[PDB]
Amino acid sequence: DTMKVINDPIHGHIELHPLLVRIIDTPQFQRLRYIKQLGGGYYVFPGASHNRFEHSLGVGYLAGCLVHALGEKQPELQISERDVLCVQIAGLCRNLGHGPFSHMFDGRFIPLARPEVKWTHEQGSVMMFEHLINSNGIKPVMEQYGLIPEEDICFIKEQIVGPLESPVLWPYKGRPENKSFLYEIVSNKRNGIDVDKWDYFARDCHHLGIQNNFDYKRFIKFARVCEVDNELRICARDKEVGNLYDMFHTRNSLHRRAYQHKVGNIIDTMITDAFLKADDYIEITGAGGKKYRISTAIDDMEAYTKLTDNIFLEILYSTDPKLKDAREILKQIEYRNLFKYVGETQPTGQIKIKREDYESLPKEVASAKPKVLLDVKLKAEDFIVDVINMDYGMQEKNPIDHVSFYCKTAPNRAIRITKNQVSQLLPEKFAEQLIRVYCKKVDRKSLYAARQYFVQWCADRNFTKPQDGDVIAPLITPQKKEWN
Amino acid sequence: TMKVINDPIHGHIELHPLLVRIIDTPQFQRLRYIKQLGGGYYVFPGASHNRFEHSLGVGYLAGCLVHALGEKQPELQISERDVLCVQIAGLCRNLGHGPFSHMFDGRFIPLARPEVKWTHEQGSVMMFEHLINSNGIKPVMEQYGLIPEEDICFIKEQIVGPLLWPYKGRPENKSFLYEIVSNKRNGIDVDKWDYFARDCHHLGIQNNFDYKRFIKFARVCEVDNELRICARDKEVGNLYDMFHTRNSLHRRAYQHKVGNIIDTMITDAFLKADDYIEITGAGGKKYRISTAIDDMEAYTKLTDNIFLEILYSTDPKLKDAREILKQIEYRNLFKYVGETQPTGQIKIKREDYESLPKEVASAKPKVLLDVKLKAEDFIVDVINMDYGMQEKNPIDHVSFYCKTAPNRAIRITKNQVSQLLPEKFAEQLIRVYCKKVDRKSLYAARQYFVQWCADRNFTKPQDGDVIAPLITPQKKEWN
Amino acid sequence: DTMKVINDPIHGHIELHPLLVRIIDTPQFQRLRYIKQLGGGYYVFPGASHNRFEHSLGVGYLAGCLVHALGEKQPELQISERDVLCVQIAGLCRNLGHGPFSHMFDGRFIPLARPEVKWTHEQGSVMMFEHLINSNGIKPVMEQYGLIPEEDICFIKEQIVGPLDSLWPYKGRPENKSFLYEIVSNKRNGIDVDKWDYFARDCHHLGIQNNFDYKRFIKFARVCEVDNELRICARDKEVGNLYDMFHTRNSLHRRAYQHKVGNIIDTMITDAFLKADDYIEITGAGGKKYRISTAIDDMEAYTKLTDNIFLEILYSTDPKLKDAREILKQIEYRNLFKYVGETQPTGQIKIKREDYESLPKEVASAKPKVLLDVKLKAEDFIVDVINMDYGMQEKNPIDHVSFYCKTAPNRAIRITKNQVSQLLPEKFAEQLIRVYCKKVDRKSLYAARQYFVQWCADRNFTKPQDGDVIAPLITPQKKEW
Amino acid sequence: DTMKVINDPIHGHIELHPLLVRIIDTPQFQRLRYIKQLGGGYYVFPGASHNRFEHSLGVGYLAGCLVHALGEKQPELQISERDVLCVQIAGLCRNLGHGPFSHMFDGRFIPLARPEVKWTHEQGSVMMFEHLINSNGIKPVMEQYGLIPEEDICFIKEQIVGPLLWPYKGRPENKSFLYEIVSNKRNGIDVDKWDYFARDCHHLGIQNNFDYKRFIKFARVCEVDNELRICARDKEVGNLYDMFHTRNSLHRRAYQHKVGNIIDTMITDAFLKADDYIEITGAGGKKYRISTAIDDMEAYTKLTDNIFLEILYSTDPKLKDAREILKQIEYRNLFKYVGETQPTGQIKIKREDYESLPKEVASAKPKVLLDVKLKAEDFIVDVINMDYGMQEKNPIDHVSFYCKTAPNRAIRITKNQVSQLLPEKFAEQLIRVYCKKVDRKSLYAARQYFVQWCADRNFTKPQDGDVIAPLITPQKKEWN
Numbered sequence A: 001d002t003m004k005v006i007n008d009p010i011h012g013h014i015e016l017h018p019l020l021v022r023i024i025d026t027p028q029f030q031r032l033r034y035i036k037q038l039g040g041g042y043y044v045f046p047g048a049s050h051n052r053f054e055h056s057l058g059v060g061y062l063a064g065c066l067v068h069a070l071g072e073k074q075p076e077l078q079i080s081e082r083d084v085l086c087v088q089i090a091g092l093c094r095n096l097g098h099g100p101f102s103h104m105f106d107g108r109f110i111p112l113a114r115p116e117v118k119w120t121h122e123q124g125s126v127m128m129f130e131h132l133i134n135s136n137g138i139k140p141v142m143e144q145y146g147l148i149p150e151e152d153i154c155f156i157k158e159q160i161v162g163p164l165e166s167p168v169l170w171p172y173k174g175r176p177e178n179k180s181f182l183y184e185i186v187s188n189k190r191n192g193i194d195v196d197k198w199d200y201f202a203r204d205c206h207h208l209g210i211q212n213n214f215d216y217k218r219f220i221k222f223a224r225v226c227e228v229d230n231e232l233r234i235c236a237r238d239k240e241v242g243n244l245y246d247m248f249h250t251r252n253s254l255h256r257r258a259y260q261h262k263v264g265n266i267i268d269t270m271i272t273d274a275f276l277k278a279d280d281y282i283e284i285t286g287a288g289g290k291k292y293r294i295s296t297a298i299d300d301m302e303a304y305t306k307l308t309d310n311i312f313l314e315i316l317y318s319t320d321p322k323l324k325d326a327r328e329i330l331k332q333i334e335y336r337n338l339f340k341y342v343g344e345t346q347p348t349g350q351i352k353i354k355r356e357d358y359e360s361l362p363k364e365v366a367s368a369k370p371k372v373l374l375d376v377k378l379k380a381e382d383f384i385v386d387v388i389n390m391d392y393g394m395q396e397k398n399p400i401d402h403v404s405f406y407c408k409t410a411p412n413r414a415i416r417i418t419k420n421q422v423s424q425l426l427p428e429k430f431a432e433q434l435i436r437v438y439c440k441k442v443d444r445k446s447l448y449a450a451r452q453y454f455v456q457w458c459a460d461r462n463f464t465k466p467q468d469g470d471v472i473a474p475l476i477t478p479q480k481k482e483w484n
Numbered sequence B: 001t002m003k004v005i006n007d008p009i010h011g012h013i014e015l016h017p018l019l020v021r022i023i024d025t026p027q028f029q030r031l032r033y034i035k036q037l038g039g040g041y042y043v044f045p046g047a048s049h050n051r052f053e054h055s056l057g058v059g060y061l062a063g064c065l066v067h068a069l070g071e072k073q074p075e076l077q078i079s080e081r082d083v084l085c086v087q088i089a090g091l092c093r094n095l096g097h098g099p100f101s102h103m104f105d106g107r108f109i110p111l112a113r114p115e116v117k118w119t120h121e122q123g124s125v126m127m128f129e130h131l132i133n134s135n136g137i138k139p140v141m142e143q144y145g146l147i148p149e150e151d152i153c154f155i156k157e158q159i160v161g162p163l164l165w166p167y168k169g170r171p172e173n174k175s176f177l178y179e180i181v182s183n184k185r186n187g188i189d190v191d192k193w194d195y196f197a198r199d200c201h202h203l204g205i206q207n208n209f210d211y212k213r214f215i216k217f218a219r220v221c222e223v224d225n226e227l228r229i230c231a232r233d234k235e236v237g238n239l240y241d242m243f244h245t246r247n248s249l250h251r252r253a254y255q256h257k258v259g260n261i262i263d264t265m266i267t268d269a270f271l272k273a274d275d276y277i278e279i280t281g282a283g284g285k286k287y288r289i290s291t292a293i294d295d296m297e298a299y300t301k302l303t304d305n306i307f308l309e310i311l312y313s314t315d316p317k318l319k320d321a322r323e324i325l326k327q328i329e330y331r332n333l334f335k336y337v338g339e340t341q342p343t344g345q346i347k348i349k350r351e352d353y354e355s356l357p358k359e360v361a362s363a364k365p366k367v368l369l370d371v372k373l374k375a376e377d378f379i380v381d382v383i384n385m386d387y388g389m390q391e392k393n394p395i396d397h398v399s400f401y402c403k404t405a406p407n408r409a410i411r412i413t414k415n416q417v418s419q420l421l422p423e424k425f426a427e428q429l430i431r432v433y434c435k436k437v438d439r440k441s442l443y444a445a446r447q448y449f450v451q452w453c454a455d456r457n458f459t460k461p462q463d464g465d466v467i468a469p470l471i472t473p474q475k476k477e478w479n
Numbered sequence C: 001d002t003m004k005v006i007n008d009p010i011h012g013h014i015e016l017h018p019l020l021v022r023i024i025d026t027p028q029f030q031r032l033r034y035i036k037q038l039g040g041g042y043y044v045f046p047g048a049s050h051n052r053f054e055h056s057l058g059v060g061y062l063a064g065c066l067v068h069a070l071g072e073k074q075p076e077l078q079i080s081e082r083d084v085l086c087v088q089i090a091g092l093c094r095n096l097g098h099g100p101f102s103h104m105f106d107g108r109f110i111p112l113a114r115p116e117v118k119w120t121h122e123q124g125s126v127m128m129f130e131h132l133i134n135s136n137g138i139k140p141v142m143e144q145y146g147l148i149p150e151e152d153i154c155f156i157k158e159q160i161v162g163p164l165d166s167l168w169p170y171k172g173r174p175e176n177k178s179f180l181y182e183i184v185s186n187k188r189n190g191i192d193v194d195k196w197d198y199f200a201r202d203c204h205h206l207g208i209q210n211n212f213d214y215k216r217f218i219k220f221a222r223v224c225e226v227d228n229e230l231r232i233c234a235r236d237k238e239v240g241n242l243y244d245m246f247h248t249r250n251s252l253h254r255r256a257y258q259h260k261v262g263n264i265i266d267t268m269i270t271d272a273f274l275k276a277d278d279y280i281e282i283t284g285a286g287g288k289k290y291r292i293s294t295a296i297d298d299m300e301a302y303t304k305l306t307d308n309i310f311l312e313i314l315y316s317t318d319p320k321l322k323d324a325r326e327i328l329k330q331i332e333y334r335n336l337f338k339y340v341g342e343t344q345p346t347g348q349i350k351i352k353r354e355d356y357e358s359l360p361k362e363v364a365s366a367k368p369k370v371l372l373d374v375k376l377k378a379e380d381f382i383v384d385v386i387n388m389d390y391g392m393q394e395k396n397p398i399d400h401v402s403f404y405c406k407t408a409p410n411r412a413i414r415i416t417k418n419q420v421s422q423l424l425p426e427k428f429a430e431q432l433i434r435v436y437c438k439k440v441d442r443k444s445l446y447a448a449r450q451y452f453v454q455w456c457a458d459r460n461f462t463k464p465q466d467g468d469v470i471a472p473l474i475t476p477q478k479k480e481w
Numbered sequence D: 001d002t003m004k005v006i007n008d009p010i011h012g013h014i015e016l017h018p019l020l021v022r023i024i025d026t027p028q029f030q031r032l033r034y035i036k037q038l039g040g041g042y043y044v045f046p047g048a049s050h051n052r053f054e055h056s057l058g059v060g061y062l063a064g065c066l067v068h069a070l071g072e073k074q075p076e077l078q079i080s081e082r083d084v085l086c087v088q089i090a091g092l093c094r095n096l097g098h099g100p101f102s103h104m105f106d107g108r109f110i111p112l113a114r115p116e117v118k119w120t121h122e123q124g125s126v127m128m129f130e131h132l133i134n135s136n137g138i139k140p141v142m143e144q145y146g147l148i149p150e151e152d153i154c155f156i157k158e159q160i161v162g163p164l165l166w167p168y169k170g171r172p173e174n175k176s177f178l179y180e181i182v183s184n185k186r187n188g189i190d191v192d193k194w195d196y197f198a199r200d201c202h203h204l205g206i207q208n209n210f211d212y213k214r215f216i217k218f219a220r221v222c223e224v225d226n227e228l229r230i231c232a233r234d235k236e237v238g239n240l241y242d243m244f245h246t247r248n249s250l251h252r253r254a255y256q257h258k259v260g261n262i263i264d265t266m267i268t269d270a271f272l273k274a275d276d277y278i279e280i281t282g283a284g285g286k287k288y289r290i291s292t293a294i295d296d297m298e299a300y301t302k303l304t305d306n307i308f309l310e311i312l313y314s315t316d317p318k319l320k321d322a323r324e325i326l327k328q329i330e331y332r333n334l335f336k337y338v339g340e341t342q343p344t345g346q347i348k349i350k351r352e353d354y355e356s357l358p359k360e361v362a363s364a365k366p367k368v369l370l371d372v373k374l375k376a377e378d379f380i381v382d383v384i385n386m387d388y389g390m391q392e393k394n395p396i397d398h399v400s401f402y403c404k405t406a407p408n409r410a411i412r413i414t415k416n417q418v419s420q421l422l423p424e425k426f427a428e429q430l431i432r433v434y435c436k437k438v439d440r441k442s443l444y445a446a447r448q449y450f451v452q453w454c455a456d457r458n459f460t461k462p463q464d465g466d467v468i469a470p471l472i473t474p475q476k477k478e479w480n
């Protein structure tokens, strides 16, 4: 019928087009009210109670702001109301595929439960969207507001997941090359600068109790479309380059402080463990009454719709003896009897730890032979090793090398700006790995031992000296001249 | 040792290890799964916050105030033991809240168990007892210099009031300690201060009350042979503003017409599910949503999760309950018809609440109607808005002091402050909703409602002339 | 010439049309950088360093927001770019007439220096605007962007000061654009974008949180026909917020704008200006010399009249300025006139401006009945009478607001107080009386308190809040207390 | 005399001890109400109306917070109320020496007006403090609250300017940590930065990412090389690198804004042209100039941003040139920015060479057709040294940490133990060029000279180089 206004603490009063309201008021979208944006982070930052639902609204809103702003400044782009709605819908719907505890689910649980499968929340989002549309009669409503479901549904999915085919050339079908800039708004595959980041920086910071340094409104004011290699792309004003390096610095800061918090991660790990132990016994009803497991609900969207953080409490409150082991792990979380952090280190020089080797690392730690007197001997199964890849969103690459700029004197001429033209105070590398070790045995003597093994293992592997190495393992650190 | 927690409202808070021990229990962690504002989250999407983090905030502010009093007035002899007891009461005064907070004790329990008298306060005391006993907290209390017999009594009295000087946990010279966490005298306490700041931060409303300022100007003075907390005289304006703010937040957020109808629909689903949901309590015994309040072990497991357990159920017994919740997801809500108030001396009694839908349906609007509506099609919600003490002005129950004589307590009357203040401190709002959502039913509902307002001499609804143009002319008082 | 972007801490990045930039980059506008928004308030709230310049930008921006929003929701109103620019210019320029220390200048100084004259900053703003336009060749630039200077300059002035009887008293725009006159300075009910900026800005600087949400109000605003005029109407639901807006404004006056010490600093600075008025020379048109009190008669001189006057006096060496300089030095040492207390008339007693001067005499004539070391005279007392209201004297401004309902968005309606809440104010205007003593020693102050409380008793004013503590021998005589 | 409560928008309600109130309520301190914290920055960021006065209160407040927090956690340090007051006073008084438009005055004006002299606002602050104490009878009041003026005044001055071997006399080595609070000479981590980050951000419209309250919670005193020093928890090292990143961001965005700087430059020009004619009365009625008021504190007390308006509103023909420059600011007829570049070579451009740079630019021979020829005096070259506060050095190498397992054992943490994503260098220079000739043809020419000069000197390619000087940039293969 008519536009709704929603009060968001980040963005203020947002107007929602009635088509978007229709998309939001569905079981598939409302589901996101029951999935914490930061997963286990809430168990460390008590303000982070926010869910994916409200983040989704924010992304939808910002996507519309950016496309409206481009259209207002450059009418020659011929951006239609139809384009605007499609970009907003993609913004609203790019989080639809998230599972219980967000990144815990696709980062930890699915890889261990279904190692053969290749699943991402992105793929999930496309499938959920299709299901949402078909289950709720949205196509007619789309037609009613001037959308063309065939081409526009394709466009929306492409915005979320990228090209739907191997093209080897313009690989997209939803819109032609003259609207290429529309594909940079919601999920920017070229350099990662998109409205999804802008919402979460502001939102997460507001809830975590950290201040956000990046100003997206400013960026929107200075954004333009220019021709670059026969494509119309979004370009930033030259003097905004510093702000973009700061944007990636901020993202990395938030990962260091919050998203990869050592305890937040171990809680995610413990919850994953409980889910693995419960996977054989929890039943989720999907299409036609078929029963699915936590690990297989991703194969049926009707079942996936019912897969939320609620799983955690269903396990916790269970009485079935089959779920006793799973339930015991979650109860250890409530009593704050968590696996203990032992320490952190990094590979040196060129060493790069491969995903294939992740499983062998607890074995390596337990095989270390620290020359120290020990009351307990520990085994591989007592250790957890968490490898975390930190980067600027593009592996080893500098994402600012993939950004186009324009100058005040020639607003339609796109240019490139190299790192050396900006500052010598910027990073020389754009990717690194952190290795965290934890012990499942929490008593004082086990922990003392775990520390000796860990520091010995660092020495053996030529990893960096842990920050507290000399205090936790004073008998081990002297053997390594490189550390002294 | 002490833990540091980052709260977005208060910054980095330090927690004494005894408090950490209380927090890391199933009974306290439970509060992570109970939304502070209940159905409000379905209207204000930023209001995802739960009772857990509000509890931390209250505990922190309680310690701030008692610490500030001790530092300014060492002659009060506030001990570390006193400080911990006040902080614990602050942490634990929300323990008794049920699913969707005020929905549970404001709507559900009254309907499910009309004979019983339950408040979240009473719940908090029982939960606290259970928390202490289940988790071996008494020894830990002793280890930090608390005396469990007296101090547990003190903590409970702080939460629920008296279980002559009616308190046993502390003597009259420490009377001021009973004003911090839950202030029975005038409602000015640290619980409000946290929720103002917290709710505002998440709702997207800006808070006008400055509790840090109030703490800077607070003192203890002798008042009628009690040592009480007194405010500086010139802070009287800020206190009237505090109650104005609280009332604003109720108008805007806590009593939002749609937030309330969602709470009402969820309550309805819970009533229809109550016979079939089983919650396991002590010794494996089974309880219902409505009886879990009788066993704390069962109550520990009663959270907002009930909503999803119903929503995801496949049992045909829960089909009716499940349908109501599904209507929430599709946003097929009962429809708001309008709002009015009693005039003059009229006051609607709780005993009459159930007869009101019947009255509305009995109205005889002189208008042509496609459909005829029945009592069961109407919901009438009566909301009592006040400054926390019925008809009374809470500032008449506040003691002040002046800069020239800091130890001399005084009273300040409304007329000494401003003539721009309220003349009344309590009112009732009546909201009417229709369970029949189609265009023709709604049109009819509006005619009944406005006719009923006219019959009862209630105030003219704001949109009365637009929704019922044929009805409003009959009432000269309305024009 | 292209748009400039400016970063404001209240509003974020604001775009300024090149015509507005041209208006801003003039001596007449830049002048506002040297005039504190809150005057003597900075001497109490150290965060209130803000000046009228940045408040002006904010008002200009919000004016454009509201008119853009109305045009976007209701294209049938035919709001032109020309209309938008005129409203933004009026927003930018409505503070041009402010003098040194803002409300100190027209609230205290001019009334005492030039009692015969009737001056308001509004009138000042119109005159300054005219001077700004003419001095800087702005008329051609206006033409270049599609404005018609004759009509549009008239429109801008009318927005600031009102009509320069009749059904339609305005010449700048016809009745079908009536709603444009409600944006910058709303004469009908006071709800305008000037308040919205200062609520947000003052709060941000004072360290008080603002509770009024103007972005919400903009979303719900519409134009409807009311008594053959097109007016801005608010959604019915929003009536509570509007009462809260006036409550907030009153709160900010109580806490900040009428702070007892902020006011006494304003008073002392005014006193210094009065004692310096004969000796400070301000050069105006054709080299003529003016005084602080007469610079309002020449805009070229007025352009040079800012808070700088304070420091010119303070740093002076001329013995002529010794008395003025001494008062300002007392401010630096914080040897301020002392606050004695506050009271109010009872019920419907009202004090009038003609009587203000006789009040120090009345206080000094009181005969307390208490042992006193010192006897005080009329010249030792300052009596400050402050009229607090909701912007329209005794009237409820919400009775002058039009609303619409969700079921009929084009039908305007009225909402009375009783349809909203019984918890709202029963009166919308009141007076506060503050007494101060110029003699600051302990004994004088003790005495001043006895006179004050006795005078309250004699006049049947309300009992001061600390009356029983400051004058325990006086308050018992009054049973009503 | 009792405590006063003051409402600050950054810190909330702050309590001020009556001795501090006495120090504040003096002409020498109140002066700071008339000196903008960010100088010409207000002419670019309209929210930056804030003055040094309120920043000084903030620093005083934060200094007391930190010293109280250390005393509360570690009573064995024997921190006295006397220590607390001395640290708070130093915090309040470290900005006393600032001149008109803050860093414009000692960064630009004094170096040009008095090239022979070596003046810093720090030195100014000690001299102003001495003058404040003596002029206002503060010593007796200090005694009244248990201070010992001889040793405590020395302590306060040392906190501000450093030593006037354990080089300090105000306090012994067992109180070394007290010297790290207000102006930290060792690594730059002090409460002054914490206030200005929060305050500047609040006013500029930029969000601050550094959390000082958190840092205070984790701070401890430990023994390091026979000194008791403030140590940070090991975990917090990342936050400290972020602190310096933030400081550098604020310099890039705000403090060194290209237009903010050129306004500072133009105001400095006006002051130089007015210096012979403005008279400031100092001790015994002696007259001083803007450039010599630093030699008499009584005169310096009267030297504030007011000078700007005194010049602007002047009618004296002697001040006509100075007044014209300021009027160009009001009309926004500013010197024009031409561009920015950096050295590639490791030697920093030296301060001794700064003056020769406009000559070099004008001597460039761009191979381009030009309507106008420009001269050295038409160019301004601004050299800006950006660093993490310690020249080429990493300040985090000068920080001591402790671990949770051994709180009393101080340790060091090297860059490689933290991250590979951190800077490899900690100092750099930016070179900005501006033209005093503002017309279209002059500016076109200025751009050709500038880019040619960058090419000749092997500086980095300006960001818009290809657009502003398309005929010049091809000659340089390193840029292509």
Ligand SMILES: Nc1ncnc2c1ncn2[C@H]1C[C@H](O)[C@@H](COP(=O)(O)OP(=O)(O)OP(=O)(O)O)O1
Residues within 6 Å of the ligand: A044, A045, A046, A209, A210, A256, A257, A258, A263, B004, B005, B006, B007, D211, D214, D235, D239, D404
């Ligand atoms: N860098 C940071 N900035 C802001 N908040 C943080 C940061 N790191 C953690 N927090 C939050 C999360 C918690 O609520 C609180 C305490 O976290 P943290 O200091 O890491 O405790 P911890 O228990 O993990 O460390 P430890 O046990 O090693 O002392 O602060």
Ligand SMILES: Nc1ncnc2c1ncn2[C@H]1C[C@H](O)[C@@H](COP(=O)(O)OP(=O)(O)OP(=O)(O)O)O1
Residues within 6 Å of the ligand: B210, B213, B234, B238, B403, C044, C045, C046, C207, C208, C255, C261, D005, D006, D007, D008
């Ligand atoms: N109601 C208020 N809310 C917030 N800040 C306030 C309020 N009233 C005053 N302030 C500010 C102004 C000052 O920065 C600070 C102290 O002012 P205030 O409490 O009025 O002291 P005062 O010196 O005027 O009163 P007194 O000397 O009578 O105690 O608080």
Ligand SMILES: Nc1ccn([C@H]2C[C@H](O)[C@@H](COP(=O)(O)OP(=O)(O)OP(=O)(O)O)O2)c(=O)n1
Residues within 6 Å of the ligand: A005, A006, A007, A008, B043, B044, B045, B204, B251, B252, B253, B258, C216, C241, C406
């Ligand atoms: N005083 C208020 C009231 C509401 N909101 C927020 C809460 C909602 O997220 C959003 C829209 O709520 P409304 O009450 O304005 O809209 P409704 O749909 O309830 O009213 P209606 O449908 O009658 O327009 O605004 C707010 O910020 N301040």
Ligand SMILES: Nc1ccn([C@H]2C[C@H](O)[C@@H](COP(=O)(O)OP(=O)(O)OP(=O)(O)O)O2)c(=O)n1
Residues within 6 Å of the ligand: A408, C005, C006, C007, C008, D044, D045, D046, D205, D206, D252, D253, D254, D259
């Ligand atoms: N990193 C920055 C730079 C500027 N600003 C603010 C300060 C100004 O008030 C406004 C405009 O600054 P710009 O530097 O963008 O404008 P200029 O005129 O300096 O740039 P140009 O003329 O080259 O567009 O934005 C900001 O918030 N952050």
Ligand SMILES: [Mg+2]
Residues within 6 Å of the ligand: none
């Ligand atoms: Mg609605």
Ligand SMILES: [Mg+2]
Residues within 6 Å of the ligand: none
């Ligand atoms: Mg810990």
Ligand SMILES: [Mg+2]
Residues within 6 Å of the ligand: none
């Ligand atoms: Mg510019």
Ligand SMILES: [Mg+2]
Residues within 6 Å of the ligand: none
């Ligand atoms: Mg005072």
